[PDB]
Amino acid sequence: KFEIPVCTSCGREITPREHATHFICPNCGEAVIWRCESCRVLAKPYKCPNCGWEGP
Amino acid sequence: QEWKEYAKRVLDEWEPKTKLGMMVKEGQITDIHEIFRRGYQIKEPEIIDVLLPEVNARENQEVLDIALTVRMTDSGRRVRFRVLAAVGNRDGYVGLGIGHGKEVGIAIRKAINYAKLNIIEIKRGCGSWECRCRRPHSVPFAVEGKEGSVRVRLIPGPRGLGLVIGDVGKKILRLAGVQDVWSQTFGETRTTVNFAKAVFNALYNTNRVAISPEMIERYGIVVGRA
Amino acid sequence: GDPKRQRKKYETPPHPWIKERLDRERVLMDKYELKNKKELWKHETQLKNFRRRARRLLAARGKQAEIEREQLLARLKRLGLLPEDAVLD
Amino acid sequence: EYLVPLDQYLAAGVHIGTQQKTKDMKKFIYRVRQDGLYVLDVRKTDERLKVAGKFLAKFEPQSILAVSVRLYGQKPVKKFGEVTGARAIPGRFLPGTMTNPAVKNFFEPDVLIVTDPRADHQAMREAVEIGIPIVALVDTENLLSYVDLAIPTNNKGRKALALIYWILAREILYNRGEIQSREDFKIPVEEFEMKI
Amino acid sequence: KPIIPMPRSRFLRVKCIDCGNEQIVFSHPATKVRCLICGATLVEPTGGKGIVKAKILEVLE
Amino acid sequence: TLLDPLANALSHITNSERVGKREVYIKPASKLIGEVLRVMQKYGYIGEFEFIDDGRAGVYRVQLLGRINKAGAIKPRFPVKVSEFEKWEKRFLPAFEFGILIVSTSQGVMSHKEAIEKGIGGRLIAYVY
Amino acid sequence: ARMHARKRGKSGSKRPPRTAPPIWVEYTVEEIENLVVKLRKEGYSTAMIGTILRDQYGIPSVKLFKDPDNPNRNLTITRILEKHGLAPEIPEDLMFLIRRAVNLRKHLEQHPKDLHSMRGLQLIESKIRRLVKYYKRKGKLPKNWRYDPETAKLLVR
Amino acid sequence: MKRRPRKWKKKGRMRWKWIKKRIRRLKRQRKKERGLI
RNA sequence: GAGUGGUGGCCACUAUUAUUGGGCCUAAAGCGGCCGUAGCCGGGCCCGUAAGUCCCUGGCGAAAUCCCACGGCUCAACCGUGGG
RNA sequence: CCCGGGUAGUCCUGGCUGUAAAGGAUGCGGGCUAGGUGUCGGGCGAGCUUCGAGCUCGCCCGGUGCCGUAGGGAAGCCGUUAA
Ligand SMILES: [Zn+2]
Ligand SMILES: [Zn+2]
Ligand SMILES: [Zn+2]
Ligand SMILES: [Zn+2]
């Protein structure tokens, strides 16, 4: 059993071969932000759970 | 451990060219599940040859369709071979590919390489009303897929009941590790490429269903290796 | 409005010429020295009937369902195809 | 307070935008002038510049790739790459650079920066295919599709592009610690500008 | 578009120029509004917001 | 014209979930819609929902959590007994006990699981999974 | 959309959500009723009475005031007229439709070739019949009431 | 006559207008022969 | 395999009859266009009746036939005793 | 088919016929699902003005076009004027 990444914006799981991304939060540098392909295409804003910084 | 020896040979006699290949070579990634859900691109078959060596087995390699296409020119007819093939260990992982060539052997080799590049990860379980067990012998829940005009719906089936699907679906599900299933198909199933891609799309779409933590225990859901 | 007609107790494969099924059945007949294919088909029909009864009773609720489940388990144990501690699964 | 004073910002013309607008950039748009031109927000530009500098200071400097097809941005990206150690691609971006290992100049960066999302569509597409974070210099008519970090700026003016890249390089160096302070940056702003 | 529509018109406490009478009138009248004391016109009906011809003492809700 | 406010609400919820929205507005509102939303919130498919007065039937503000694969009304509202739920589960759900069939019963609106537990039937009005 | 043209115009009133009359209304219920009676005697319809009350007297709506003679009802122009014995004999919308249908028939008997106006007349008669059906069901018209163009002239007059 | 727009296509067949004219001539001839005029 | 071919008929094949569950821009197929009668489908809240609806309980819907357990013809087909 | 003439017809009035590739080859009412950009009508706000029922920009509603995201389709393509 292994952890499956979850999108930060919509909260859905990430399929194995989709154009998703993950990166360290640009503001705090502690949390990790995951964005799924649909959220990336639709430019849906995301909020960091640590700082509360919002937006792409 | 002949496949382990093969994996080690692929590991030493190989110079990586991509970032993922470099990660595999230096050992940052050690398991097959670590190259999925991260957005990485797979362009080197050596990555699959190292992480999942069983895909090179003769029983794990299946040639689904061979077609003879013709292009008209001034001189005459130019013949090309299109081979649709599938690979993958019969537990959790499967891949499908198409290869074109001037000869059947070249087409088969290219199709196998592209299937290894296109390998995916699925989820298994038991969601049938008549079984209600918690073994990964079937699809956890009903799934759908489509390619071209073919629409395929896979339904969980009781344990001990064979794959009730066409031959192409049987081969793909056997390579993916599914043992029992019911099928409902619409469209032109005689188009082998479209049928295979629809079955592959359904197996991939098994990852697109949102589930609760208790559903994993209820259906015995297994992601990747069991 | 027709009277009862006695039916066959075995089933014929959906396709008479499939290579994998033919090889598997040939292996079984050679191993167990059966005389004809309908004997193996009769045994396969018995197995399929047991499986169908189990599948039907698994998703059934009621006193009659409980009685039938216990009777099926007892019959299988008496025939000797299951251990004495087996369950419906 | 602000990385660069208001007078210098307006002189570079960062706030100057395009007659067209976009719902995605509505959150960054300040107001619309009487002639139909939209004005960006210098405060939000400064905040996003600070955020981008902090974000880019963490990556390995050789793994950052900055691209600019636009002629006015060809020189600033080259100067930024020289200053920060990052790879810079001015002018045409060869297709297959990030997706074709057989290409002689094959390279897979860890983070991409684009001068213009519309102009550098090929680089953005390849970055999306390989799955890496993307920072985009976005104008009023640009779309935030597939943009992980957007910097609101005038991505068409020569002076604006030069000032933006100079600020980004200085912030990256400061946050990485190569320069002990912002004032230690001794590279003039005019060095980034393209000479006519 | 809004989940709770709200009117764009207001009521106006208006003082008549000729006689000084105070009245409450609508900002989007479909008729010719006149003072209740002297009959002098106050608001000109139009296709939209009316034209107020008297001092607007106050704008109510 | 408008005929099924509940079906409109469920279709709107499904479309917004597919497109990735976090917040939806249901208009016009009704007590049946409120009961359905209460059932979905109890089963964890939706977040917080609130009623807003506008001098009309009302509005329902609902927060989505990205946990719904498909929600739809059932028309015609088929009457169902206690022992007939299996065929409707097969018709409307992918696997056993996966989703919930929202049923209007004589004791109120509740899911088919609670209806079976109470040993009562009703009329199928919705399905969420 | 529209009944016949099938257009989707949305112009109309946007009343704010209210439960009590506004505090800045100068007149009371009795004066409002007296004004309604005076305007009806002047000869305005219910819609014109309400429009005049909103415009000149600054009364947002009579429906905001509770009925003094019925705790379960709110005030209404027609209710005030009917309690003062001044309600119209037949519904006002039906009267207006009948009036303009009669006028259109008078025009058409001089212009028999106006087929577009004839279609407009047919639409008006269809609306009249719809309203007649509704009022027959609700008991606002006699069960033997029927619409006939020849007898509609006396009703118009 | 009922509409069959599939027959207006000219691939391997003559014009439908003239087919219709021939059919109408045939119908009139049959009616005249039967005496129905 | 003491059976195995041929022809006619019905079901599945066929989601090519489609309530479950089919289609109608270019492949078969939206009336040339509107008004409207029966029918079908119908906005929000409150009270009353239980006709539809659901639950419980009496009288029924013969036997044979269908499923299960046991018992009797060597086992079985067949029959008997109980449950459904 | 080209050219020179020419009857019915094409034109008005009272009628009949009820047919077209009468095509958007797409029945009609309602709710929801990124945007960007022209134009017509109305309304609102701001700025000009020769004070024009004039000009420019922005917003709301209703019509009328093109490009296009998610998605759909055998594809051509449709894509808030949905197919
Ligand atoms: Zn997401
Ligand atoms: Zn953070
Ligand atoms: Zn199972
Ligand atoms: Zn006055």
From Swiss-Prot, chain B:
Keywords: Ribonucleoprotein, Ribosomal protein, RNA-binding, rRNA-binding. GO terms for molecular function: rRNA binding; structural constituent of ribosome. GO terms for biological process: translation. With S4 and S12 plays an important role in translational accuracy. The N-terminal domain interacts with the head of the 30S subunit; the C-terminal domain interacts with the body and contacts protein S4. The interaction surface between S4 and S5 is involved in control of translational fidelity. Part of the 30S ribosomal subunit. Contacts protein S4. This is Small ribosomal subunit protein uS5. It comes from Pyrococcus furiosus (strain ATCC 43587 / DSM 3638 / JCM 8422 / Vc1).
Curated annotation (Swiss-Prot), chain D:
GO terms for molecular function: structural constituent of ribosome. GO terms for biological process: translation. Keywords: Ribonucleoprotein, Ribosomal protein. InterPro entries: Ribosomal_uS2, Ribosomal_uS2_arc, Ribosomal_uS2_CS, Ribosomal_uS2_euk/arc, Ribosomal_uS2_flav_dom_sf. One of its GO terms (cellular component) is small ribosomal subunit. Belongs to the universal ribosomal protein uS2 family. Part of the 30S ribosomal subunit. This is Small ribosomal subunit protein uS2. It comes from Pyrococcus furiosus (strain ATCC 43587 / DSM 3638 / JCM 8422 / Vc1). The gene is rps2.
Swiss-Prot record, chain E:
Its cofactor is Zn(2+). It comes from Pyrococcus furiosus (strain ATCC 43587 / DSM 3638 / JCM 8422 / Vc1). InterPro entries: Ribosomal_eS27, Ribosomal_eS27_Zn-bd_dom_sf, Ribosomal_zn-bd. HAMAP family: Ribosomal_eS27. GO terms for molecular function: structural constituent of ribosome; zinc ion binding. PROSITE patterns: RIBOSOMAL_S27E. Part of the 30S ribosomal subunit. NCBIfam families: PRK00415.1. A zinc finger (C4-type) spans 16-38. GO terms for cellular component: ribonucleoprotein complex; ribosome. It comes from the Archaea. This is Small ribosomal subunit protein eS27. One of its GO terms (biological process) is translation. Belongs to the eukaryotic ribosomal protein eS27 family. The keyword Ribosomal protein applies. Binds 1 zinc ion per subunit. The keyword Metal-binding applies. Pfam families: Ribosomal_S27e. Keywords: Metal-binding, Ribonucleoprotein, Ribosomal protein, Zinc, Zinc-finger. Zn(2+) binds at residues 16, 19, 35, 38.
From Swiss-Prot, chain H:
Belongs to the eukaryotic ribosomal protein eS32 family. The keyword Ribosomal protein applies. GO terms for cellular component: ribonucleoprotein complex; ribosome. Coiled coil: none annotated. Keywords: Ribonucleoprotein, Ribosomal protein. Initially thought to be part of the large ribosomal subunit. Crystal structures show eS32/eL41 to be a small ribosomal subunit forming a bridge at the interface of the 2 subunits. The keyword Ribosomal protein applies. It comes from Pyrococcus furiosus (strain ATCC 43587 / DSM 3638 / JCM 8422 / Vc1). This is Small ribosomal subunit protein eS32. Part of the small ribosomal subunit.
